[PDB]
């Protein structure tokens, strides 16, 4: 709460106010004539350190500023490029001899940290059609946890595997 | 002067607004869809939608007295994420009436019309809030324009909690339930959150709390806290669109306000947003932001049916998505088509509650052109959405200098469910955002002229310029004297003069809604005085013969063209024989088509000598039997002109609001007859054939089928007089244009009423008195009594057309009647600015009092009244008119003396006085030592009263609520049921309804006997009752009460609820328990 200085007033030694926008350095400093605009105050406006610049949007703005730096700056070649969106929705597959016949596993630019991935490859080795034995021989991740999706494929030219048939259905003795 | 443009259709558009877009923007939204699995798919198209046209029109439409509509369209795009499976074709969707010509949407029966609500448009706002003792509190809340509310607050210490949708938790994971990353807060609250570093009792842990905290860890308890569990939880409140919103403006402003970028055209929400929340709270906490305003626009807004029919709409498909969503994946789906699983069913209805049934709609009032004005446009928040009528306590009822320009003040039902009615500012329009305009039109620091732009905004609130209100000196070419002018900042009203403002009336009448600008100076007359009477003219009758006032300020006229009782040219003509019947610019083959085809156009049927055709309108019951029928104004072969009224309705001679008629009106306390309130006046009024109302109303009848053995309307059973049976018609049918009067006789229902259990004599006096009758029976119609009325249309069908008939029921006996009826006493006839009249007597055109000129005069007053009612100016008018009358003067000019800005209407006044009656040659209806007055040589047999007493012209306008509908008394009849007491719901057998705080009030006295009688022997005792009927008619001494039985009754259930009593004597033998049962 507050008081005075012993009896007084309230002395507006009016003057010109100068709202002058966040973030933006006043130009002006101390004792110094400007006057209604010839520079004044300044963000002369400096950042550091994030790459290529495609250029903010602004059409009608000023600013409605958005920086890019768009720096994932990935220079790939021969990562090509298909369709399907009939009996799905939507694609563009990647699709080169380069052992590149993927799909779009993220979007065609969706943005977000892991699992990152293009595109979905194909790849018929280490398929079948009946059923399995992993009994494999020579393949190596070590255990790793990531035996699994977190895959390690290091080494191995043989995949010993027994496919099969197994139906796991609990049912009373004597059925057929 | 500056036109005002068409009240009418807010809606209209904004009506329109929402199929030019709505009907997509939802439901393509939710467009998609598709079996369970994904594969098997379908849409909504939400493109090319298409409908057919509805050959039902509005008349057609009550023909069948249905609704009237538009079947309702679209195809789906097709069929599967499977095999791209098209099937593609139009699938109906939902059928429904909609706005029509008078501003309605003509449904079933009749044509309602839907009344606008404010409401706390969206946003997320915040106590300030304060205590027991001072020290105070801040505290934080959300709201979309539909959806939970995220609330939030401050323990006295910089502390927090959430609540939303529980009010049981003084629950706070602030950021610990959503974006959980690293101190996050110090990067989007930075200043002092909590102190700037959280508190004690606050840790902020979210690991496990994040989606799993005050979700399960106090929330919704019992099963263990899923991480899942309140993961897909806070989503389930917010992320998922189609459980909440903002609503695009909700975030137009959310964001607006708290500015933060967010454009982002989602009408959902994101994180960041919310802490600016958090912190904002806390920067008004640390008194940086400022309090929101919860009262008024500005957090309130206006919403109106595009949105009233599209919630609902998105909401009742919504029901149809769940149902789909089985119905699409029900089964197999290979061929099964959109055709197949479409159950529009559904859609159609909940609409047809949406207009039909949702509690908005009204039925239109018509019982005044002017009227629906006023009711095309109050509003309220009376809402599904709105408040209580009694928890919505006060400020709720206050005013609110945004009110001013906004909406009116005048208008009040002044009930108990008043101060809720929006008089939609008079001038005002609206935004995508509801928020309505109100003109603030420029001076440039001296200079308005009106050459300045903007005069156009303003739109629910201002702009921080000080700022101008309405009138003022207003120089030729503006310059704005006001030395020093009074003008509004911001609900404050400080001085400054032309450097700082710039806006200003474009009128001087920016607060006022349809009926409250009657008032033709109003300028002096009290507010508080202002209210009921600026509402009588809302409600007014109409009047055979119409009249536009005498005097004038004029407004309205145009509002009258609004009203669409009165008819401009669709296009243009000038009229070849204007039929009363049929005018034209119809097929005319003649010049209402030529400028029917003026500089022709093509869409409308230019091609041939031209072509507008459309029906005028007898006299039709209105929605509250009501009537006028306009009439064919403009004579032939006269030039018109596009969009000009040339049809007079109801009440316009010519764009003009007939209301009343023209009066000399002497004021003066003659042998009483009239002693507050209590009008006098001259049996001229009848003989003038003026004052007359006419009313139409239905009275229908059907026969049912009796499962009992069904029965049929007759053609007679006994006691027919042909006297009776005989303008009467060919089933029993009454005859129409036949004259009616008392207990008339509509058409013959026959009755079953056999005689199994023959009553004790019957069997024997029927075969005794010597005949053998039989009950077939019939309760056939009776007009009721005092029905002197012509008979004057029938709507009637039976089984064929499809009786589109209640079932149960075989055919409509609907028929009716009106009367030319004049006015009498009772007749709660007034004026249109603080008034309310009724009348004695009416008297020999003689005796009443007359004038030196030799006339005599029509309406006493009293003469008190007025200067009592503050409401002076009534002399205004009479005087104004009076010379209107003595020089045929008219005014049509805006209230509010602000020529010169002082007593000009004074000015006015004797001068047109002066000029008139100097050129009126007597000269004598104006006396210098009269200024004002007249004499009034008139007593009993004309002696000269006394003091010169001043007349002249009012406008005497009558009311409905005539005696006639208003009347009432009966002498006993059929009890209730369950009280078994007669009752009086107002009809011919209304109780003479009863006030207990008069039982409280006739015991003062005491005496039992009118109250033991008074009670019981008109309630509980049927045999008492009889009793009595007999005693008097049985020459006995009517005796003893019954006794009451309702008690019994009350006794009954309460035994059953749990009681006991030995109700009983006592001098018994100990007393016992006398059976009271």
């Known amino acids: 709460t507050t008081t005075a200085a012993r009896g007084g007033l309230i002395w507006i030694l009016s003057g010109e106010v100068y709202n002058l926008p966040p973030g933006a350095e006043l130009v002006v400093k101390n004792g110094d004539r400007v006057e209604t605009n010839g520079v004044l105050a300044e963000t002369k406006l400096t950042t550091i350190h994030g790459g290529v610049v495609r250029l903010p949007e602004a059409t009608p703005g000023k600013s409605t500023r958005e920086i890019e730096i768009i720096t994932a700056s990935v220079v790939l070649d021969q990562a090509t490029v298909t369709v399907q969106s009939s009996q799905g929705r939507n694609n563009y597959l990647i699709t080169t001899g380069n052992n590149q016949v993927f799909n779009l596993r993220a979007t065609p630019g969706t943005k977000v940290q892991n699992g990152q991935v293009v595109a979905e490859l194909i790849d018929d080795r280490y398929r079948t059609t009946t059923g399995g034995f992993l009994k494999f021989a020579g393949v190596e ?21 027994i496919p099969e048939e197994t139906h796991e259905v609990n049912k009373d003795i004597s059925l057929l | 002067a500056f036109l005002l443009p068409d009240l009418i259709e807010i809606q209209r558009s904004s009506f329109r607004w929402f199929l030019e877009e709505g009907l997509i923007e939802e439901l393509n939204s939710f467009s998609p869809i598709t079996d369970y699995t994904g594969k098997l798919e379908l849409h909504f198209l939400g493109h090319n939608y298409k409908l057919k046209e509805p050959k039902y029109s509005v008349e057609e439409a009550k023909r069948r007295d249905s609704t009237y509509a538009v079947q309702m369209y679209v195809p789906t795009r097709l069929l599967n994420k499977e ?59 959300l709201i979309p324009n539909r959806g939970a509310w995220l609330k939030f607050e401050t323990d006295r210490n910089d502390l927090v909690w959430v609540r939303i949708d529980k009010t049981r938790k003084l629950s706070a994971q602030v950021l610990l339930k959503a974006l959980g990353l690293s101190d996050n807060e110090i990067f989007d609250a930075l200043r002092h959150p909590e102190y700037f570093q959280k508190t004690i009792e606050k840790e902020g842990q979210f690991s496990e709390e994040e989606a799993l905290m005050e979700l399960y860890r106090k929330l919704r308890p019992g099963e263990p806290p899923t991480v899942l569990g309140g993961q897909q939880l806070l989503d389930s409140r917010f992320f998922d669109p189609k459980r909440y919103d903002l609503g695009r403006v909700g975030r137009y402003k959310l964001n607006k306000k708290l500015r933060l970028s967010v454009p982002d055209t989602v009408r959902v929400l994101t994180s960041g947003d919310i802490l600016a929340a958090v ?38 498909l919504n029901r149809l998505e769940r149902i789909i969503r089985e119905r699409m994946t029900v089964s197999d789906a290979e061929v099964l088509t959109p055709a197949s699983l479409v159950n529009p069913k559904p859609l159609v209805a909940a609409i047809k509650e949406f207009f039909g049934s949702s509690q908005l709609s009204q039925f239109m009032d018509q019982t005044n052109p002017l009227a629906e004005l006023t009711h095309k446009r109050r509003l309220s928040a009376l809402g599904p959405g709105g408040l209580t009528r009694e928890r919505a306590g006060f400020a709720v009822r206050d005013i609110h200098p945004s009110h001013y320009g906004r909406i009116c003040p005048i208008e009040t039902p002044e009930g108990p469910n008043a101060g809720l009615i929006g008089s939609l500012a008079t001038h005002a329009r609206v935004n995508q955002y509801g928020f309505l305009e109100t003109p603030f039109r420029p001076v440039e620091n001296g200079r308005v002229r009106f050459d300045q732009p903007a005069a156009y905004m303003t739109a629910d609130e201002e702009d921080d310029l000080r700022v101008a209100p309405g009138d003022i000196p207003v120089d030729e070419n503006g310059y704005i004297i006001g ?158 002109v596009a969009g000009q009224v040339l049809a007079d309705g109801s009440s316009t001679e010519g764009g003009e609001l007939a209301l009343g008629q023209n009066i000399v009106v002497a004021y003066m306390p003659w042998e009483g007859y009239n002693y507050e309130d209590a009008i006098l006046i001259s049996e001229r009024l009848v003989q003038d054939d003026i004052y007359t109302s006419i009313h139409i109303e239905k009275y229908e009848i059907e026969a049912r089928q009796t499962k009992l053995g069904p029965e049929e309307i007759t053609r007679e059973i006994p006691n027919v007089g042909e006297d009776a049976l005989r303008q009467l018609d060919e089933q029993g049918i009454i005859r129409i244009g036949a004259w009616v009067e008392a207990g008339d006789i509509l058409v ?58 209640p079932p149960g029921a075989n055919m409509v006996v609907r028929v009716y009647v ?93 001068g047109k006085l002066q000029e008139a009656r100097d050129e009126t040659g007597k000269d004598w209806v104006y006396n210098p030592d009269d200024p004002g007055k007249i004499m009034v040589y008139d007593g009993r047999t004309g002696e000269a009263f006394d003091r010169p007493v001043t007349i002249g012209v009012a406008y005497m306008l009558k009311l409905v609520h005539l005696v006639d509908d208003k009347i009432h008394a009966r002498s006993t009849g059929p009890y209730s049921l369950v009280t078994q007491q007669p009752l009086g719901g107002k009809a011919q057998q209304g109780g003479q309804r009863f006030g207990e705080m008069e039982v409280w009030a006739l015991e003062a006295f005491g005496a039992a006997y009118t109250l033991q009688e008074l009670l019981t022997v008109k309630s509980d005792d049927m045999q008492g009752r009889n009793e009595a009927l007999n005693a008097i008619v049985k020459g006995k001494a009517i005796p003893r009460p019954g006794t009451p039985e309702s008690f019994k009754v009350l006794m009954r259930e309460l035994q059953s609820l749990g009681l006991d009593i030995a109700v009983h004597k006592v001098e018994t033998q100990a007393d016992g328990s006398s059976l009271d049962v």
């Open chain 2, 279 to 316: 912190d904002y709270l806390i920067n008004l906490e640390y008194d940086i932001g400022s309090i929101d305003d919860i009262d008024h626009l500005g957090n309130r807004r206006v919403r109106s049916v595009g949105e009233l029919l599209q919630n609902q709409v998105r909401v009742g």
């Open chain 1, 141 to 161: 991740v070590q255990k790793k946890g990531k035996a699994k999706l977190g895959y390690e494929v290091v080494q191995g030219g043989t995949l010993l595997w």
């Open chain 2, 748 to 805: 013959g229902k026959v009755t079953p009423k056999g005689e199994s259990d023959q009553p004790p004599e019957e069997k024997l006096l029927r075969a005794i008195f010597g005949e053998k009758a039989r009950d077939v029976r019939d309760n056939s119609l009776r007009v009721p009594n005092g029905e002197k009325g012509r008979v004057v249309d029938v709507r009637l069908f039976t089984r064929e057309q499809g009786d589109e008939l």
């Open chain 2, 83 to 141: 095999t791209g499976d098209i099937k593609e074709q139009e699938v109906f969707i939902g059928d429904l009436p909609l706005m029509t010509d008078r501003g309605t949407f003509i449904i079933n029966g009749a044509e309602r019309v839907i009344v606008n609500q404010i409401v706390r448009s969206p946003g997320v706002y915040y106590k300030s809030e304060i205590d027991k003792n001072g020290r105070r509190t801040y505290s934080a809340s």
């Open chain 2, 483 to 640: 030395p020093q002018v009074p003008v509004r900042y911001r609900q404050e009203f400080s001085t400054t003069t032309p450097e700082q403002v710039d806006y200003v009336a474009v009128s001087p009448v920016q607060i006022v809604s349809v009926a409250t600008s009657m008032i033709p100076f109003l300028e002096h007359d009290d507010a508080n005085r202002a209210l009921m009477g600026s509402n009588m003219q809302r409600q007014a009758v109409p009047l055979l013969k119409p009249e536009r006032p005498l005097v004038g300020t004029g407004l309205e006229a145009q509002g009258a063209r609004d009203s669409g009782m009165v008819i401009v040219s669709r296009t243009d003509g000038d009229v070849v024989y204007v039929d009363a019947t049929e005018i034209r610019v119809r097929v005319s083959g003649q010049l209402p088509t030529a400028s029917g085809k003026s500089t022709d156009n093509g869409q409308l049927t230019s091609q041939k000598g031209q072509e507008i055709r459309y029906t005028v309108s007898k006299y039709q019951r209105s929605n509250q039997d009501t009537c006028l029928n306009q009439k064919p104004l403009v004579r032939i072969g006269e030039r018109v």
């Open chain 2, 818 to 910: 009106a009367q030319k009826r004049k006015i009498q006493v009772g007749d709660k006839m007034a004026g249109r600015h603080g008034n309310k009249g009724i009348i004695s007597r009416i008297l020999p055109i003689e005796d009443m009092p007359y004038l030196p000129d030799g006339s005599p005069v029509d309406i006493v007053l009293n003469p008190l009244g007025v200067p009592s009612r503050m409401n002076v100016g009534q002399v205004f008018e009479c005087l104004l008119g009076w010379a209107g009358h003595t020089l045929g003067v008219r005014f049509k000019i805006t209230p509010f003396d602000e020529m010169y800005g002082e007593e000009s209407s004074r000015r006015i006044v004797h």
